[PDB]
Amino acid sequence: EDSERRPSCDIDKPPPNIELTGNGYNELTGQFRNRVINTKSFGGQCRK
């Protein structure tokens, strides 16, 4: 409830569709695959 350090320092949005960047890739079928790497992480380190 008492959120210290002003979470996210008033930063609103990530890149538009980084979820597609998190998605996998297939080579022999040319069709993409599911999200594997959680690019939506932040590690606390707000990079503005």
Partner: protein, 49 residues
Amino acid sequence: PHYILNTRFRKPYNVESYTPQTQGKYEFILKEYESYSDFERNVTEKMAS
């Protein structure tokens, strides 16, 4: 947080990932064909004796 077209969305617990993909391909095949045919035969014969 989830962002789609400058709009903040919610991902439910059952959906793994819902990402908008462009993936656009259209095909347009038009056909044109015409055929003409004409025939005419004039025949005239006269005999007098």
